[PDB]
Design a protein around this ligand. Structure first.
Ligand code: HEM
Ligand SMILES: c1cc(SSc2ccncc2)ccn1
Length: 465
């Protein structure tokens, strides 16, 4: 219609700030959607953004017009350090170049293959030892899980795992959890609107920047070490591979393979390969203790298909529809990245009689699809049946989009699914979950919701079975 999607009239500079609640962006947007429709325009400060709500609107854009919506938008906090470099926040040629290399290199190191499956199984065994080590005490699982998860991707990018005792490793994981939570707080979402000003003011954002610089510094050190010990004929990990390609691209003035893209791309994979799976696992166990009946059914299936002796393997999932449904329901309820990572229209285009000019930022509301009442009967309830038919067999859903969809969807989905199944299964096979409080007093509502969905802090006991 030559006109952008409908939305509330914005004010100079602050945009629609007054009609939004930074502490509850999702609820604020859904409220506006009820008045303007499933597809609308919003102004986060001066950033004009088109919001897509519900399965239909999201799929039509990201898949039906995949190319048109294949551009990458921004996440102001992360942009502070990335500045458009690296695979995640890059665009155009840089994006096509870095993504293609990352996926291939990832495959070269076992992802999607027996190689990484064995890596995950071994790390899962280390988690089991670590959990038995607690002696059934009631502890905070947070870093036990993130250390295990992080060691998988760390093996690939750094060529080796971290010792669970390594204090520098714990420091890194704390940096990641800190940034992740900051982007999900009110100040974090306020930052998304007013970064032009806030990046220069005192406040929590400065601490978040500190944590990003800490992470970047660690990667820079790793790169330098690999540089002065590199064997161009035999790469030890993702970093070496990128370094070799960089050597080959030296006589190319326009190459995308240079130090800054190496540092940022590796940072993307280190953070990306750690925080979301870790958060999903953490939310998952809380959900299971909240619903004892589900844990019991999971135990019945594991003992039947796998038993108590052997280590779970990825091929076991095809014989475990219940576990498969439980994990899917954990990702659906968890809604870890509720508004996905912002996209951007790559070229002027028409969408549902709306005119979207090149460069227009887009917010695919994944959370609104994971809870779309047209695909799930009681979207607000944690219920594995959402992914099972009456015969107890696994039932797929077009609205299951926790990894998003389209041209810039998560290429870490393969690794993540294998980690979620092996870690969830191996932990449940060996332990019974014991909550600190009664199932009735357990609060599963999120602590923060912004860029991500963060579960409340909690402690628990892992009692051997
Ligand atoms: C349960 C875990 C995970 C969730 C929920 C998740 C979610 C997402 C989402 C929603 C996106 C944005 C997609 C889009 O723009 O349309 C994405 C991007 C991405 N994810 Fe993940 N992810 C997970 C795990 C992984 C893992 C394990 C890695 C690391 C190997 C990873 C790396 C990436 C990368 C590199 C991108 C950017 C892709 C691009 O811009 O082309 N993710 N992820
Ligand atoms: C820095 C921050 C992020 S945001 S957390 C995340 C997003 C998508 N997939 C996994 C983790 C991703 C890559 N690099």
């Amino acid at each position: 219609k030559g006109k952008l999607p409908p939305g509330p009239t914005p004010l100079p500079f602050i945009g629609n700030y007054l009609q939004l609640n930074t502490e509850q962006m999702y609820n604020s947007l859904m409220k506006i959607s009820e008045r303007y429709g499933p597809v609308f325009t919003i102004h986060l400060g001066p950033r004009r953004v088109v919001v897509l709500c519900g399965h239909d609107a999201v799929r039509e854009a990201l898949v039906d017009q995949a190319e048109e919506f294949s551009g990458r938008g921004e996440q102001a906090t992360f942009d502070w350090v990335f500045k458009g470099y690296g695979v995640v926040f890059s665009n155009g040629e840089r994006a096509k170049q870095l993504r293609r290399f990352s996926i291939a290199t990832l495959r070269d190191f076992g992802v999607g293959k027996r190689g990484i499956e064995e890596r995950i199984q071994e790390e899962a065994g280390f988690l089991i030892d670590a959990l038995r080590g607690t002696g059934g005490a009631n502890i905070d699982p947070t870093f036990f899980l993130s250390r295990t998860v992080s060691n998988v991707i760390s093996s690939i990018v750094f060529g080796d795992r971290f010792d669970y005792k390594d204090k520098e490793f714990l420091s890194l994981l704390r940096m990641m959890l800190g940034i992740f939570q900051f982007t999900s707080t009110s100040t974090g979402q306020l930052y998304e609107m007013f970064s032009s000003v806030m990046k220069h003011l005192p406040g929590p954002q400065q601490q978040a920047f500190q944590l990003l610089q800490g992470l970047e510094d660690f990667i820079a050190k790793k790169v330098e070490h690999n540089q002065r010990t590199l064997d161009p004929n035999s790469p030890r990990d993702f970093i070496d591979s990128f370094l070799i390609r960089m050597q080959e691209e030296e006589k190319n003035p326009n190459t995308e393979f240079y130090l800054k893209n190496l540092v940022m791309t590796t940072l993307n994979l280190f953070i990306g390969g750690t925080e979301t799976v870790s958060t999903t696992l953490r939310y998952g166990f809380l959900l299971l203790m909240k619903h004892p009946e589900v844990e019991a059914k999971v135990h019945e299936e594991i003992d039947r298909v796998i038993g108590k002796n052997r280590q779970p393997k990825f091929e076991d999932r095809a014989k475990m529809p219940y576990m498969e449904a439980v994990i899917h329901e954990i990702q659906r309820f968890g809604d870890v990245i509720p508004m996905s990572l912002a996209r951007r229209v790559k070229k002027d285009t028409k969408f549902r009689d709306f005119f979207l000019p090149k460069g227009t930022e887009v917010y695919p509301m994944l959370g609104s699809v994971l809870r779309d009442p047209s695909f799930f009967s009681n979207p607000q309830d944690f219920n594995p049946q959402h992914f099972l038919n009456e015969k107890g067999q696994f039932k797929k859903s077009d609205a299951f989009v926790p990894f998003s969809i389209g041209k810039r969807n998560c290429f870490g989905e393969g690794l993540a699914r294998m980690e979620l199944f092996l870690f969830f299964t191996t932990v449940m096979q060996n332990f019974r979950l014991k909550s600190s409080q009664s199932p009735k007093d357990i609060d599963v509502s999120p602590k923060h919701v912004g860029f991500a969905t963060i579960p409340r802090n909690y402690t628990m006991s892992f009692l051997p079975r």
